[PDB]
Symmetry: D2
Subunit: 310 residues, 4 copies
């Protein structure tokens, strides 16, 4: 079935591309302020379809979003020199104040998947503006970082990543929490199963993995100036979760009534994703340190929200 | 790359078919005492390939197994009226005494995947006859039962099966142990996460699921007289593990030095499967009851082995 | 979406398996006179699903076919040795007289895919009994044979089978016509492009290929006593055509108002397959010999029909 | 199963992405002058892998290309506005004079897949600098254009694109030739099968389709400023042809001893692609007009070559 993407820039277009190569959705509609850009991306992708899957990819207006199961909000403004993360945040909040109602007008049944950075806050803004139930608005959140964590662990232990269950929670960004505490492999505690293999996870190792997960976006942005590909494919996977009513577990950003003592904040927790959006929350055990860090992350997300008027 | 299958009957042929439809291997070689049968299965499957994948499926002799990474041993005798499980076991043991050296002569260079029932014992016999390291001989074991467990649980909790970690261990058969103890969903304890939805599992629920897992084979055999399809696809997935050096976790039957107090027995535990066969064992927490049941299962498998002279 | 299968024997069950491993349809319903058989096949396949795709496979009754896009008719009687092809044919015609209305009662919108041999005649019987438009009733026909032809040619010329366009037409059976005349590779005449490579197709080559195609079914039946796997996957591919509204070209059996001079007969011609069944016919150039042979095939199919009262 | 990509920009990175999402290769090496760029693209894509396939994607130097079956040459300089197509071409030719010997030093076994525009000429330059046999150097050529032709025809006819054989030949660019003449559907002449469905192609429809093909790249570049996605996936499909020794037919650019009267020129013709590169050419029937247009295209490609010194 059908998926909308509003915001046709690098992230939007990469998401479309991934949807198309993976054969997730039958239909993909690109909507962008610059009409010509969306059309160009659409046609470029359309060129690729014959080498993967019969996906109808096209550019249109908000109205064309009718019936989309999900709409990804990838929109946002040109970064501007000598402008505080705050001013940018403001201009984007304004973009979303345009976009959300219009998307909802056409496709009142859709789930909104929020892309645009910073993702937790934008997720808050969209939840606020949508007047939908909280679970209908999902931010992409920490999924890439969680996946990378699982990957580095997998690689350390010489085990399939699929057998590694570990989480990254909180703000997607520097304050994100890697939960080492309750992490497991094959359903047994990580660090135990570390001895149980020949591989005791020195704090130095812990630190090496942390750098690996934490600084990946920074490096990507330093070398190429933006991230698209990873998130494009993550968004694709979430869109697939939504369309197949998978009810699978992903660490995503949503409005949470209370987390670690903080009230009414959007951030990433493991959540059950399916056709109506998120349908349930999974609480892994946190150590006191991790809980404290989560609490901090949430606090700071919450003050951001407040500073912006959300 | 290349996979051998010895014994061409319903299980062997179904395994080949699954290999072929899933596109696991490049090449599948069927070897059977009845040459015409293997050739007929081969060509039937060959007919199917154009509707899935370019897989070369053909019938040959043991020598044709050269270079196969894995060889599935599906061989075994016609069951015969009012013959004890013992006499059958005996005749099969002798089949394997033929087959094993012949397979290893041609493909000294292979992992043996044991199909033939009863699977744990047959796995013991093959381990014994091979003189290979224990991990090069793997029985299909409890995988179907573990997967169905995961499935029934998944279905109870309204959650994707992928997010359910639960095990079935021991003898593949009536003994088998369902480990409810350490079972989890999304990396958190099952029963906890039961109340953590709309969930609490009543003992009659646990019993309904237990019937579901455990007596499945019996029902299948009562209706159609044999099981092939499930194990065909299970075998396929293990073969894929082996060929891709996946190092993933499966509950499979192998020779284990000690389990739950019993010495030198073959049975199903979660094991790490990869290119050289099993490469490590994962020990989930067992409750005292579960541990006792496991101990029992092992004991009985071990006496079977002994009775047969293994 | 949803597919029905009526008759649960080797062909039915294999088709179900294939549908499931290939992830064609979300739902597969097995309906068989012997309820226990259908249920056992269903559960055996269900065991396989976790190793491929989330397909819901279950056994039920005709009423449970509601909403299926396609229903495969695989039913039919136990053979009896020394019983003429005619009496068998009769026995089956009566089976279909039982099945067809019942299938159309529950799922009046469905396309009927006719498996049961001899397939052309059964296809006629089903067309007659259905009172549907002709294109709603499609026999599996010559597809396996056409694919095999393409394959052997592909292998002769050292070229991908995808590039080879060649047909097998008429009765599925001995009298089938291999069209060598208009056969091409990469859109250019076969025999020409034969000199255009290093291989000029001697008549004994032609003959070798002919043997390869026409007698395959015979060999399979001599070795294993029945064919299932190939047609299982073919049926699967046709089902996928119908459910995706592929409008792709397959040589299938359907009621044809006139072919090569013969009137109102069912046989295999290249036809465009899609959501409403066949939607158009493609006429390849035939040589006078080929046309004659086709005419013969049709004549004999038609007299068969008449002898049976169709 | 390893693939190199030299030059890291939009086309290179998109090709890597596509390789990775489609699960073509086990390993993808990015090599770019700007080391940081390659690394960033690599890591961004790596982030995506967990949502599709276990592909190892990394950035390294030419030496790291050892053992690659194919290496895509995507490199090429920044376009300066004002600058004639000739100066650009000169700058690119020098880039290739650096790159080719380096790639062949590390991976003397590989097959060069030429990306960089203008593709036919760059393909010539690479062939010349390689000193390899002609079929070892393959340009991406007209593939996207051929596929869109087939697509628009398929759409007109309401038939699956897979059943449409039609070609685009010559210079990838404005002077490319659509062969309407020998085009067929289901192995029968297009225009005939046009009346054979209801609705023949009118000079107006032929023109509508022509615009659709020939001008696509222009529109894409006017809207987004570059094309990547389509060719990324095309390149991917070609790489898959090479690695699976597919021997399939693609219209690609290679050095051709003679075409339509012109001598020693590189351009797109249907060619048989496999593990050693191209392995044979397929000559479709051309009408005199088509013939003439091809000869023109070739002439102009050849003068381009000469002007540059090739
Ligand atoms: N009000 C709006 N409605 C729709 N699209 C918008 C609006 N404002 C900005 N956009 C689009 O959002 C896109 C952002 O793309 P880009 O700057 O690459 O950021 P990202 O990398 O997050 O996609 C731009 O292409 C712009 O056209
Ligand atoms: N000594 C042997 N060597 C090779 N193949 C054998 C030998 N003994 C039996 N077989 C084959 O093993 C197959 C047994 O499979 P079958 O009894 O049909 O169902 P299952 O797959 O459950 O065993 C038979 O088809 C037979 O041809």
């Amino acid at each position: 079935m059908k998926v909308g993407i509003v915001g046709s820039g690098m992230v939007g277009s990469a998401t479309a591309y991934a949807l198309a190569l993976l054969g997730v959705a039958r239909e993909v509609v690109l909507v962008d302020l610059d009409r010509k850009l969306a059309q160009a991306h659409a046609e470029d992708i359309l060129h690729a379809t014959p080498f993967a899957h019969p996906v109808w990819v096209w550019a249109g207006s908000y109205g064309d979003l009718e019936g989309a199961r999900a709409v990804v909000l990838a929109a946002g403004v040109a970064q501007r020199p000598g402008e505080t993360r705050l001013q940018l945040l403001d201009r984007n909040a304004q973009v979303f104040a345009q976009v959300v109602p219009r998307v909802l007008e056409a496709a009142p049944e859709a789930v909104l998947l929020v892309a645009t950075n910073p993702v937790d806050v934008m997720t808050q803004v969209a939840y606020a503006l949508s007047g939908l139930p909280p679970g209908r608005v999902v931010g992409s959140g920490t999924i890439l970082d969680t996946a990378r964590f699982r990957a580095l662990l997998a690689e350390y232990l010489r085990v399939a990543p699929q057998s590694v269950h570990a989480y990254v929670l909180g703000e997607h960004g520097d304050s994100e929490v890697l939960v080492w505490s309750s992490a497991q492999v094959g359903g047994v505690p990580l660090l135990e199963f570390a001895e149980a293999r020949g591989r005791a996870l020195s704090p130095e190792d812990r630190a090496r993995i942390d750098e690996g997960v934490r600084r990946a976006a920074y490096r990507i942005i330093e070398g190429k100036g933006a991230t698209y590909y990873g998130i494009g494919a993550g968004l694709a996977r979430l869109v697939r979760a939504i369309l197949t009513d998978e009810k699978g577990v992903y660490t995503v950003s949503a409005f949470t009534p209370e987390v670690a003592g903080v009230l009414e904040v959007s951030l990433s927790l493991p959540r059950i994703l399916g056709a109506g959006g998120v349908a349930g929350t999974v609480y892994p055990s946190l150590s006191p340190e991790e809980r404290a860090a989560l609490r901090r992350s949430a606090e700071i997300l919450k003050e951001a929200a407040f500073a912006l008027g959300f």
